[PDB]
Motif scaffolding. Structure first.
Motif, PDB file in Angstrom:
ATOM      1  N   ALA A 133      26.379  44.333  28.593  1.00  0.00           N
ATOM      2  CA  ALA A 133      26.351  44.188  27.489  1.00  0.00           C
ATOM      3  C   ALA A 133      27.789  43.652  27.020  1.00  0.00           C
ATOM      4  N   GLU A 134      29.137  43.909  27.996  1.00  0.00           N
ATOM      5  CA  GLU A 134      30.284  43.758  27.395  1.00  0.00           C
ATOM      6  C   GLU A 134      30.668  44.328  28.745  1.00  0.00           C
ATOM      7  N   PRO A 135      30.616  43.160  29.713  1.00  0.00           N
ATOM      8  CA  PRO A 135      31.465  43.648  30.770  1.00  0.00           C
ATOM      9  C   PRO A 135      33.593  43.764  30.795  1.00  0.00           C
ATOM     10  N   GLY A 136      33.545  43.695  29.643  1.00  0.00           N
ATOM     11  CA  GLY A 136      35.363  43.018  29.475  1.00  0.00           C
ATOM     12  C   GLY A 136      35.805  43.878  28.615  1.00  0.00           C
ATOM     13  N   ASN A 137      34.930  45.034  28.264  1.00  0.00           N
ATOM     14  CA  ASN A 137      35.958  45.852  26.861  1.00  0.00           C
ATOM     15  C   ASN A 137      36.328  46.792  28.375  1.00  0.00           C
ATOM     16  N   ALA A 138      37.980  46.843  27.741  1.00  0.00           N
ATOM     17  CA  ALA A 138      38.337  47.313  28.220  1.00  0.00           C
ATOM     18  C   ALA A 138      37.760  48.840  28.409  1.00  0.00           C
ATOM     19  N   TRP A 139      38.024  49.710  27.513  1.00  0.00           N
ATOM     20  CA  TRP A 139      37.464  51.123  27.142  1.00  0.00           C
ATOM     21  C   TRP A 139      35.945  51.176  28.697  1.00  0.00           C
ATOM     22  N   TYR A 140      35.272  50.213  28.041  1.00  0.00           N
ATOM     23  CA  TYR A 140      34.007  50.145  29.005  1.00  0.00           C
ATOM     24  C   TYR A 140      34.548  50.563  30.069  1.00  0.00           C
ATOM     25  N   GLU A 184      33.505  49.730  44.579  1.00  0.00           N
ATOM     26  CA  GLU A 184      32.427  48.862  43.360  1.00  0.00           C
ATOM     27  C   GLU A 184      33.133  49.030  42.301  1.00  0.00           C
ATOM     28  N   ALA A 185      34.555  49.378  41.661  1.00  0.00           N
ATOM     29  CA  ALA A 185      35.141  49.922  41.128  1.00  0.00           C
ATOM     30  C   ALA A 185      36.969  48.815  41.093  1.00  0.00           C
ATOM     31  N   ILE A 186      36.811  48.216  41.537  1.00  0.00           N
ATOM     32  CA  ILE A 186      38.007  47.840  42.095  1.00  0.00           C
ATOM     33  C   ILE A 186      37.540  45.749  41.572  1.00  0.00           C
ATOM     34  N   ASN A 187      36.031  46.206  42.363  1.00  0.00           N
ATOM     35  CA  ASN A 187      35.330  44.422  42.100  1.00  0.00           C
ATOM     36  C   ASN A 187      35.247  44.174  41.332  1.00  0.00           C
ATOM     37  N   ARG A 188      34.751  45.116  39.977  1.00  0.00           N
ATOM     38  CA  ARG A 188      34.622  45.263  38.724  1.00  0.00           C
ATOM     39  C   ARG A 188      35.656  45.323  37.614  1.00  0.00           C
ATOM     40  N   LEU A 209      42.056  40.909  32.713  1.00  0.00           N
ATOM     41  CA  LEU A 209      43.158  42.415  33.616  1.00  0.00           C
ATOM     42  C   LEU A 209      44.773  42.069  33.911  1.00  0.00           C
ATOM     43  N   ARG A 210      45.076  41.171  34.136  1.00  0.00           N
ATOM     44  CA  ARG A 210      46.177  40.666  33.703  1.00  0.00           C
ATOM     45  C   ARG A 210      47.346  40.992  32.825  1.00  0.00           C
ATOM     46  N   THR A 211      46.966  40.871  31.279  1.00  0.00           N
ATOM     47  CA  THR A 211      47.813  41.264  29.768  1.00  0.00           C
ATOM     48  C   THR A 211      46.623  42.478  29.328  1.00  0.00           C
ATOM     49  N   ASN A 212      46.024  43.926  29.932  1.00  0.00           N
ATOM     50  CA  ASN A 212      45.607  44.593  29.311  1.00  0.00           C
ATOM     51  C   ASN A 212      46.106  45.635  30.010  1.00  0.00           C
ATOM     52  N   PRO A 213      47.379  46.423  29.928  1.00  0.00           N
ATOM     53  CA  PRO A 213      47.534  47.592  30.338  1.00  0.00           C
ATOM     54  C   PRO A 213      46.561  48.813  30.850  1.00  0.00           C
ATOM     55  N   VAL A 214      45.653  48.922  29.943  1.00  0.00           N
ATOM     56  CA  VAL A 214      44.381  49.974  30.591  1.00  0.00           C
ATOM     57  C   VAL A 214      43.523  49.374  31.879  1.00  0.00           C
ATOM     58  N   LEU A 215      43.490  47.707  31.859  1.00  0.00           N
ATOM     59  CA  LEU A 215      42.455  47.600  32.790  1.00  0.00           C
ATOM     60  C   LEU A 215      44.264  47.926  33.477  1.00  0.00           C
ATOM     61  N   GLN A 216      45.171  47.463  33.733  1.00  0.00           N
ATOM     62  CA  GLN A 216      45.997  47.076  35.163  1.00  0.00           C
ATOM     63  C   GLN A 216      45.773  48.275  36.144  1.00  0.00           C
ATOM     64  N   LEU A 217      46.111  50.303  34.872  1.00  0.00           N
ATOM     65  CA  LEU A 217      46.235  50.977  34.932  1.00  0.00           C
ATOM     66  C   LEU A 217      45.313  51.566  36.432  1.00  0.00           C
ATOM     67  N   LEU A 236      43.224  49.535  37.679  1.00  0.00           N
ATOM     68  CA  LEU A 236      42.667  48.874  38.434  1.00  0.00           C
ATOM     69  C   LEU A 236      43.853  49.496  39.920  1.00  0.00           C
ATOM     70  N   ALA A 237      44.605  49.430  39.244  1.00  0.00           N
ATOM     71  CA  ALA A 237      45.587  50.609  40.294  1.00  0.00           C
ATOM     72  C   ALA A 237      44.864  52.153  40.476  1.00  0.00           C
ATOM     73  N   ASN A 238      44.865  52.991  40.100  1.00  0.00           N
ATOM     74  CA  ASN A 238      44.191  53.797  40.632  1.00  0.00           C
ATOM     75  C   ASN A 238      42.726  53.431  41.514  1.00  0.00           C
ATOM     76  N   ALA A 239      41.999  52.519  41.305  1.00  0.00           N
ATOM     77  CA  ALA A 239      40.808  52.335  42.138  1.00  0.00           C
ATOM     78  C   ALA A 239      41.625  51.575  43.675  1.00  0.00           C
ATOM     79  N   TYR A 240      42.355  50.726  43.836  1.00  0.00           N
ATOM     80  CA  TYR A 240      42.927  50.986  44.825  1.00  0.00           C
ATOM     81  C   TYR A 240      43.805  51.423  45.270  1.00  0.00           C
ATOM     82  N   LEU A 241      44.322  52.543  45.116  1.00  0.00           N
ATOM     83  CA  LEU A 241      44.588  53.924  46.082  1.00  0.00           C
ATOM     84  C   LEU A 241      43.760  54.447  45.947  1.00  0.00           C
ATOM     85  N   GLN A 242      42.597  55.034  45.210  1.00  0.00           N
ATOM     86  CA  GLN A 242      41.271  55.535  46.065  1.00  0.00           C
ATOM     87  C   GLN A 242      40.135  54.978  47.092  1.00  0.00           C
TER      88      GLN A 242
END
Length: 175
Positions: A31-38, A54-58, A65-73, A75-81
């Protein structure tokens, strides 16, 4: 409500019951695919189940993404894994600059730069982690090594030496 469902999913997540967490979180995310905490929780669930792509593509599909630090961190973790340390480091070099007091960001950057064989950057990120843990002498030692590895007279060397100066005078307030 949504608060109850989010709380239930997070509790499952922390008990490493990823499937239970996923089933509870999924309708909130749909329902809220861009809620940073979901997205934050969805990332942890997917990485827990070895679904980094899957986590990266989402996360790549989130507007903030580019302005929210929660989303940035995340995506960085997902890329690493997901076996993509280069894209993780691209994010983390911006993240650690904009969030200098976040030890998670420095630890992730250190992991990425070790994976990328970027040695002085790895040293610098490990030094910043030590500084945040109060190990200031050791941070200065690693930052000194990092400075000594980049070209003499470069801006990068100057940046590392400036960090050393900042760590030393911080030591002074604890003597």
């Amino acid at each position: 409500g949504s608060a109850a469902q989010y709380g239930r999913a997070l509790q499952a997540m922390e008990a490493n019951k990823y499937d239970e967490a996923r089933k509870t979180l999924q309708p909130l995310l749909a329902a809220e695919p861009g809620n940073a905490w979901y997205l934050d929780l969805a990332t942890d669930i997917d990485l827990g189940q070895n679904k980094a792509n899957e986590a990266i593509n989402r996360l790549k599909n989130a507007r903030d993404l580019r302005t929210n630090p929660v989303l940035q961190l995340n995506l960085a973790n997902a890329y690493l894994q997901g076996g993509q340390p280069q894209e993780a480091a691209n994010i983390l070099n911006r993240y650690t600059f904009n969030n200098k007091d976040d030890s998670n960001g420095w630890d992730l950057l250190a992991q990425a730069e070790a994976a990328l064989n970027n040695r002085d950057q790895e040293l610098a990120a490990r030094a910043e982690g030590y500084a945040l843990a109060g190990r200031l002498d050791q941070a200065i030692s690693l930052m000194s090594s990092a400075s000594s590895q980049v070209k003499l007279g470069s801006l990068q060397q100057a940046r590392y030496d400036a960090r050393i100066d900042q760590l030393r005078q911080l030591q002074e307030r604890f003597k």
